[PDB]
Structure 1
Amino acid sequence: PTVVLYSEDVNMETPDTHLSYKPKMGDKNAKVMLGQQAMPNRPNYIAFR
């Protein structure tokens, strides 16, 4: 063997971005979903009057 990979599990979650192209409506990641695209949310500036 010439490649060793360490597999782990993470708490993946996006706090401020949303998808701009989702290939299919379903979950259960497959090869088709290996190319979805994200983009950031619009800014908000809540403050006193």
Structure 2
Amino acid sequence: PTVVLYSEDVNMETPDTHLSYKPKMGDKNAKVMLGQQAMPNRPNYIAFR
């Protein structure tokens, strides 16, 4: 063997980015889900008048 990978899991998420394009309505990642797309969400500017 010439490669050693490491298997680990994290609780990652996305706090400010929505999905521009999704292949199919299903989750449970498959090969096609390799190539989805995402777009950052619009800025918001709450404050005092």
Provide TM-score, normalisation by structure 1: 0.96
Distance 1:16 1:42 in 2: 9
Provide TM-score, normalisation by structure 2: 0.96
**Aligned Cα root-mean-square deviation (Å):** 0.4
Shift in Å, 1:38:
0.5
Shift in Å, 1:39:
0.6
Which runs of no fewer than 5 residues in structure 1 stay unpaired? none
Shift in Å, 1:12:
1.2
Shift in Å, 1:3:
0.3
Percent pairwise identity: 100
Query: Would you say how many aligned residue pairs link Structure 1 and Structure 2?
Result: 49
Distance 2:27 2:18 in 1: 15
